[PDB]
Amino acid sequence: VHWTQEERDEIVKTFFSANSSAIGTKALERMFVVFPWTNAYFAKFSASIHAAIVVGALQDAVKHEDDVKAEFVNISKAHADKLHIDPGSFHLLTDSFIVELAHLKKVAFTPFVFAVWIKFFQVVIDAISSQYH
Amino acid sequence: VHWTQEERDEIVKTFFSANSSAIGTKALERMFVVFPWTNAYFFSASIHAAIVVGALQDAVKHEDDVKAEFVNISKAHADKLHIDPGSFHLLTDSFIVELAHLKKVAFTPFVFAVWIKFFQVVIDAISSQYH
Amino acid sequence: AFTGVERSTIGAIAKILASTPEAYGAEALARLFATHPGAKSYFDYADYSAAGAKVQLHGGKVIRAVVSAAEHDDDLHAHLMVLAVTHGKKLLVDPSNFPMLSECILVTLATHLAEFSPATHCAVDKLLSAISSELSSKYR
Amino acid sequence: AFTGVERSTIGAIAKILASTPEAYGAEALARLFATHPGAKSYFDYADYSAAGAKVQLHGGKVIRAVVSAAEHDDDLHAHLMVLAVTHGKKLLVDPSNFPMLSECILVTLATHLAEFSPATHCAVDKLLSAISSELSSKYR
Numbered sequence: 001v002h003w004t005q006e007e008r009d010e011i012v013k014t015f016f017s018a019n020s021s022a023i024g025t026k027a028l029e030r031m032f033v034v035f036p037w038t039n040a041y042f043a044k045f046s047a048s049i050h051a052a053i054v055v056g057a058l059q060d061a062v063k064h065e066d067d068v069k070a071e072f073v074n075i076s077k078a079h080a081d082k083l084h085i086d087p088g089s090f091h092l093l094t095d096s097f098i099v100e101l102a103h104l105k106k107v108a109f110t111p112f113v114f115a116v117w118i119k120f121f122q123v124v125i126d127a128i129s130s131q132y133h
Numbered sequence: 134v135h136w137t138q139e140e141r142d143e144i145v146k147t148f149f150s151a152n153s154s155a156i157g158t159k160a161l162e163r164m165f166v167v168f169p170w171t172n173a174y175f176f177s178a179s180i181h182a183a184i185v186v187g188a189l190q191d192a193v194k195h196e197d198d199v200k201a202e203f204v205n206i207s208k209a210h211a212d213k214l215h216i217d218p219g220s221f222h223l224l225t226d227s228f229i230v231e232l233a234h235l236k237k238v239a240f241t242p243f244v245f246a247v248w249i250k251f252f253q254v255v256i257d258a259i260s261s262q263y264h
Numbered sequence: 265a266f267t268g269v270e271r272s273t274i275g276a277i278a279k280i281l282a283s284t285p286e287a288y289g290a291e292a293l294a295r296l297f298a299t300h301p302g303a304k305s306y307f308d309y310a311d312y313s314a315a316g317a318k319v320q321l322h323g324g325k326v327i328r329a330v331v332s333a334a335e336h337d338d339d340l341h342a343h344l345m346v347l348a349v350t351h352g353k354k355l356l357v358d359p360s361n362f363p364m365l366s367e368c369i370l371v372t373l374a375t376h377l378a379e380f381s382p383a384t385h386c387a388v389d390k391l392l393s394a395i396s397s398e399l400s401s402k403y404r
Numbered sequence: 405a406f407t408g409v410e411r412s413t414i415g416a417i418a419k420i421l422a423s424t425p426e427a428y429g430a431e432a433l434a435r436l437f438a439t440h441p442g443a444k445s446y447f448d449y450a451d452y453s454a455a456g457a458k459v460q461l462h463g464g465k466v467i468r469a470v471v472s473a474a475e476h477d478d479d480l481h482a483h484l485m486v487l488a489v490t491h492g493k494k495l496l497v498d499p500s501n502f503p504m505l506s507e508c509i510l511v512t513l514a515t516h517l518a519e520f521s522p523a524t525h526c527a528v529d530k531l532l533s534a535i536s537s538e539l540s541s542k543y544r
């Protein structure tokens with residue numbers, strides 16, 4: 001994946017100053033209401049606690065925009081091999097995040113900035129999906 | 134994209150033994166029936182199948198570098214022909230069905246997953262220049 | 265499929281869309297084209313942004329139609345048949361495109377509406393899913 | 405929208421599948437797992453090939469339900485409601501899995517049937533898509 005400077009800056013500045021855990025908390029909560037079947041993994045609990053986990057990993061992808069795949073090996077195995085998360089459900093989480101970034105950013109969330117976030121998340125989805133075999 | 138030898142061999146030997154033109158011609162006719170909207174763009178099915186199958190052979194010749202050989206094919210589809218890339222897998226999925234037809238019991242879930250993988254690589258290559 | 269609370273919420277959303285269908289529509293289609301450029305393949309446009317005259321035109325038509333679907337919550341199958349025939353038989357739009365557009369409409373509302381709670385989003389997404397279904401129903 | 409020719413072909417395919425449901429269903433599932441390993445997430449199995457005992461059991465259930473659906477072409481909504489509730493609310497299956505399975509059943513038929521014309525394939529796919537639609541109908 002190649003990145004423009006505006007893509008790097010848009011992602012990096014957002015993680016630097018936005019309340020990303022609060023975003024993650026709302027995104028998770030949203031994903032449960034909009035896509036209820038996704039709550040199945042959490043019967044097995046605080047949304048806020050879980051967002052803190054996800055957000056740490058996103059920040060890990062942020063710090064390494066060019067090597068995300070390589071940093072997600074152990075994360076991905078855990079999701080495939082131990083936790084039994086359907087990888088087809090990963091984008092339901094990231095799409096909810098995008099809805100929460102829209103809510104924060106309002107008219108600054110242009111279609112163009114929107115596409116930066118979609119690109120970011122697909123790199124993340126590919127990275128966390130890579131060890132499903 | 135990393136290939137097992139079994140994957141390279143299954144794809145390479147099929148291309149060198151089966152009549153993939155014939156497969157293509159039938160896969161085009163199948164896609165037109167099962168997915169009528171894809172006929173919009175189109176003529177001879179067998180002559181077009183020749184050209185499609187040419188590109189796939191090109192992909193098979195260079196399994197580690199499919200994107201870079203597909204640039205110009207990809208630009209043509211995006212910029213001149215204005216093909217919806219979301220429809221690519223409707224052709225490649227029809228190819229799989231015709232492969233199933235030919236290979237019958239030898240079209241195991243494993244071998245089936247080989248063709249799926251090959252076609253996904255193809256889809257990604259031909260989709261790459263949509264901007 | 266529609267609870268009283270969703271029907272109310274859809275109604276309120278429909279009224280806000282109705283005020284500015286071209287603005288909402290143009291923006292949602294601009295999102296589509298930006299996040300899924302394959303969708304540009306249907307349109308011979310010079311400008312694929314919300315500024316584009318022809319994007320504005322199609323955008324209003326989209327949102328006006330969503331508004332009408334909203335005023336047809338228990339009839340959608342019959343109400344949407346005309347549009348299912350145009351998209352499915354004349355324009356031949358690949359059906360995979362409808363749920364991409366849906367998500368782009370939802371994101372547009374999220375950037376605009378003072379309130380877009382998970383319950384509200386759920387309500388609208390249900391309307392859009394039923395619309396996608398009907399629009400995808402007369403292909404074959 | 406099933407033409408009489410489609411109804412007749414579907415009827416024919418239904419009797420075939422009815423003869424060997426576990427055979428066909430276990431193969432279609434092993435195909436799902438092989439092509440879309442994300443689908444394994446739902447199943448606590450040790451063996452995901454068509455030789456798996458639990459694959460065979462779910463396989464037979466899947467195919468018999470398809471066979472029985474083939475008898476309800478005019479009232480699939482009512483007919484598939486319990487299955488839709490079971491998959492949607494209890495098992496909590498992500499609906500994107502349904503078309504993956506459908507395509508895997510189509511491939512399975514293509515490797516076995518004495519005749520799998522584009523016309524016949526279309527007839528079956530329309531049935532399977534109708535089924536996928538119902539099974540995706542009771543999530544929310």
Ligand code: HEM
Binds near residue numbers: 038058083093
């Ligand atoms: C795709 C974006 C995601 C990222 C970046 C992410 C990240 C993580 C990380 C880093 C962990 C901790 C693993 C460990 O070290 O033990 C985790 C755990 C977990 N994830 Fe994800 N995850 C994502 C998506 C999902 C989704 C969609 C679900 C299901 C809806 C999910 C379900 C879980 C569960 C149940 C745990 C374990 C929580 C616990 O028991 O402590 N994850 N996630």
Ligand code: HEM
Binds near residue numbers: 181189214221
């Ligand atoms: C993904 C597999 C595909 C491959 C490998 C492929 C390959 C090709 C190639 C190599 C050409 C000739 C390029 C040239 O003119 O220099 C071509 C032309 C064309 N393709 Fe594709 N294509 C694929 C999918 C599709 C699909 C799915 C459609 C429509 C749904 C499509 C529509 C067309 C059309 C209309 C032409 C021009 C044909 C003519 O004027 O006779 N292609 N394709």
Ligand code: HEM
Binds near residue numbers: 357395
């Ligand atoms: C909720 C979904 C949508 C609705 C309600 C809708 C509605 C409409 C309406 C009312 C018209 C004019 C039709 C007529 O004159 O009879 C139209 C035209 C058209 N629609 Fe849609 N549409 C939707 C989604 C889409 C999508 C997703 C695409 C492709 C990605 C598309 C492609 C077109 C095209 C190409 C035209 C012709 C005008 C032009 O080129 O700008 N539509 N639509």
Ligand code: HEM
Binds near residue numbers: 462469
């Ligand atoms: C044509 C589509 C399908 C049909 C007709 C079908 C039918 C059935 C039936 C009759 C049962 C027995 C459960 C019961 O009612 O007591 C069952 C169980 C189950 N199904 Fe499906 N199914 C389909 C697709 C899928 C898919 C795509 C998945 C997931 C990828 C899935 C996941 C499950 C699970 C997890 C169970 C129960 C767990 C177990 O059997 O041990 N189904 N299915």
